[PDB]
Paper text:
Prion protein (PrP) aggregation and formation of PrP amyloid (APrP) are central events in the pathogenesis of prion diseases. The c.593t > c mutation in the prion protein gene (PRNP) results in a phenylalanine to serine amino acid substitution at PrP residue 198 (F198S) and causes the most severe amyloidosis among GSS variants.
We report that in GSS (F198S) APrP filaments are composed of dimeric, trimeric and tetrameric left-handed protofilaments with their protomers sharing a common protein fold. Each protomer comprises nine short β-strands, with the β1 and β8 strands, as well as the β4 and β9 strands, forming a steric zipper. APrP deposits in GSS (F198S) are composed of N- and C-terminally truncated fragments of PrP, formed through proteolytic cleavage of the precursor protein. The sequence of the APrP forming peptides does not include the F198S mutation, glycans or the glycosylphosphatidylinositol (GPI)-anchor.
Numbering used by the authors:
A (entry chain C), B (entry chain E), C (entry chain G), D (entry chain I), E (entry chain A), F (entry chain J), ...: 80 to 141
Write the structure that this text describes.
């Protein structure tokens, strides 16, 4: 089967939304990876009213 | 079967929402990974009204 | 079977919501991992009104 | 069978919600792991009105 | 089967939305990767009212 | 001197307010009046979040 | 002097306000009046978020 | 002097406001009046977000 | 002096406002009046976001 | 002096405003009047975002 019927309206009723991003020196390192991954929505910096999705069925031979 | 019918409206009734992100020196390291993973929504920096999803069925031979 | 019909509206009745994130020097390390994992929503920095999901059925040979 | 029909509306009746995160030097280390895990919602930094989920049935040969 | 009928209208009821991104020296490094990945929407800098998607079924021989 | 600095914010913290007015046959009669009167706010039917005032200094000769 | 500095913000924190007016046969009669009167806000039927005022200094000779 | 500096913002924090007016046979009668009157805001039928005022200094000889 | 500096912004934070007027047979009668009156805003039928005013200084000889 | 500096912006934060007027047989009668009156804004039928004013200083001899 499988399925994700995400549904309905969404949002702010009214009023205000204030988003600030002020990081100084973030660091990300990686070394030696050989797997698989997925994510519909990834937030690095900032945002909203962001809709993502993912659907993945990879085959890896190694 | 499987399924995730996430549904209904959502949000703030009204009023205000104030979000601040001020990290100084976060660090993430990784080394030597060979598995699999998934997540519909990942928040690094900041956000809201963010909708993600994931659906994954990988095959890894190694 | 399996299934997760998360449903209904949700939010703040009204009034205010104030979220502050001010970490100084968090550090995360990892080394040598070979399994599998999943999570629909992961919060690193900050957020709200965040909806995620995950559905995963990987096969790993090693 | 299996199933988790989490449902109903939820939130704050009104009034206010104030969330502060000010950790100084948290550290997380890991070394040598080869199992499996899942969690629908994981909070690192901060948040709310966060809805996650997980559904996982991996097969690992090793 | 598989499918993700994300649907319904979404947005801000009214009022305001203010988004600021002021990172100083973020750094991302990577070295030696040979797997597969997908994500419908990825936010580096900033944005909103962003809709992405992904659908992927790669075969990798190695 | 004289003065009425009515002040401060007021209202419902949140939650609900339900007001019903269902009178059947109210009757008001008057006959032969020759004086003076004042009231800042008068509620006949129904209401709320009603702010009135009065300030009066009439001279009547008769 | 005299003065009425009514001030401050006012309203409903959030949530709901439901006002119903269903009178059947109200009757008001008057006969023979020769005075003076004032009121900043008068509610006959229904309302809210109604702000009135009055300021009156009539001279009547008769 | 005299003065009425009514001030400040006002309204509904959010949520809803539902106003119904369903009177059947109201009747108002008057006969023989010779005075003076004032009111900044008068609500017959229905309304809201109604702001009125009055300022009156009539001279009547009779 | 005299003065009415009504000021500040006003309105609905967000959400909804629903106003219904369904009177059946209201009747208003008057007979024989010889005075003076004022009101900045008068609501017969229905309305909102209505701003009126009045300023009056008549002289009547009779 | 005298003066009414009504000021500031006003309106609906967002969301909706629905106004219905459905009276059946209202009747207004008048007979024999010889005075004076003023009102900046009068609502018979329906409306909104209506701004009126009045300023009057008549002299009547009779």
């Amino acid at each position: 089967g499988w399925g994700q019927p995400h549904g309905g309206g969404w949002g702010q009723g009214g009023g205000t939304h204030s988003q600030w991003n002020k990081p100084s020196k973030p660091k990300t390192n990686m070394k030696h990876m050989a797997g698989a991954a997925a994510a519909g929505a990834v937030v690095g910096g900032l945002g909203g009213y962001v809709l993502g999705s993912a659907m993945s069925r990879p085959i890896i031979h190694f």
